[PDB]
């Protein structure tokens, strides 16, 4: 009852709610234990969550394509198991890319989707293409009542027309749906679109190092320590 | 060599006749008068047929599924003389929105679900089916609704959509339904298909889709009896 008008929350998935790094960093441990000794786990998961941007935004600006997102993370690991120099056969470059398919919930997450999911639709709005958010959803029990990826819309955030074509197939107004993220760049592209706004910092999501998004860069709607104090505050 | 089933919702898995007929009850409980229950819900599909037909071949223009329910109600509230205030229309065109589900549809689904993806295959607007969904609790991985797609089946865009957003081949997803005509527009699109009869979806007098028109690779008596013979191969 805090709006009255809102019954859907969009969420962002990756960082927002699951902790990619510390899950691929995991599967690269348990490969170099199979594999004969050491492999730079760390480097490898912190680079490869950088390398298809230029790739990306390559899409976004029509320069390249669309392809979706399990097909750029293959992609870009192909170019630094070149760059770093592992060489992999296809049952390996397909096993690894599938890391991203498995990752761990924030310990708030799965409580705090519970709880939300009684008074609001909960859908999924992620750079991800379906079919891997369909595993990432089976993995951690995320409890969606929709997924919303970007290769519904052939676009991927922030990109006007992922929060539009979520509230489209929501049939909603976007002053009915709010954007749940752990990023202000994304909280921003869905304010100026008319959506409500709930931040969650995740400072741990890039590792101890992390710089970017430790706090509120806008007056969004929410501001909130975990899920479940979002549901706490919505409530009231 | 099969990861997903889609499932055709009205009918095959919810009993939409008694739950419309359940709600038209309880209103006139509510209400002064009585209403044409039996009557009204019999003829409600039928009434959008045209429309739907129109949006199909072009003759109109895009409306989704709740859309052409109210434009369709509108005209049997005309018909039968009915005054109806938009708050009623509106109720009752929420009817459907809230769907009883077959004897065997959650088991079978909470079952089937543990080892493939479950994914809603409908003419239902995404957003009425996550209604069905959710008073249902029907377990949906994902929901691939003709809005998604801008047409309604068996147009092939639906079929081959669906399969493309699941990332899989046509030949690793099956389409569950109570409806030959479904199965047969699926089938032809190189899916897998499964049939279970509904023999009481229309109500006693029922005479079509009361058994298999083609060997279908699936011919289950209920969702349960799907699991069981999956689970033997
Ligand atoms: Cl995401
Ligand atoms: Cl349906
Ligand atoms: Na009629």
Redesign the interface.
């Given at each position: 009852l805090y709006f009255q008008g809102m019954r859907a929350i969009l969420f962002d998935v990756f960082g927002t709610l699951v902790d990619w790094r510390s899950s691929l960093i995991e599967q690269f441990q348990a490969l170099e234990r199979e594999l004969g000794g050491t492999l730079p786990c760390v480097e490898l998961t912190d680079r490869w969550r950088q390398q298809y941007k230029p790739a990306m935004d390559r899409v976004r600006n029509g320069q390249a394509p669309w392809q979706?997102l399990?097909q750029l993370h293959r992609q870009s690991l192909e170019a630094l198991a070149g760059e770093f120099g592992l060489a992999l056969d296809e049952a390996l470059l397909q096993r690894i890319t599938g890391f991203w398919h498995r990752l761990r919930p924030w310990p708030d997450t799965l409580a705090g989707m519970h709880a939300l999911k009684a008074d609001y639709?909960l859908a999924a709005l992620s750079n991800g293409?379906?079919?891997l958010m369909?595993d990432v959803?089976?993995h951690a029990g995320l409890p969606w009542?929709?997924?919303l990826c970007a290769?519904?819309f052939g676009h991927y955030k922030p990109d006007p027309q992922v929060y539009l074509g979520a509230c489209r197939?929501?049939?909603?107004p976007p002053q009915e749906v709010m954007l749940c993220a752990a990023h202000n760049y994304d909280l921003k592209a869905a304010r100026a679109l008319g959506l409500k706004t709930a931040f969650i910092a995740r400072p741990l999501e890039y590792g101890p190092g992390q710089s970017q998004d430790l706090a509120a860069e806008q007056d969004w709607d929410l501001i909130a320590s975990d899920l479940l104090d979002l549901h706490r505050q919505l409530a009231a």
């Open positions: 979706h399990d639709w293409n379906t079919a369909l959803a089976r009542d929709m997924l290769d519904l197939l929501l049939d909603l």
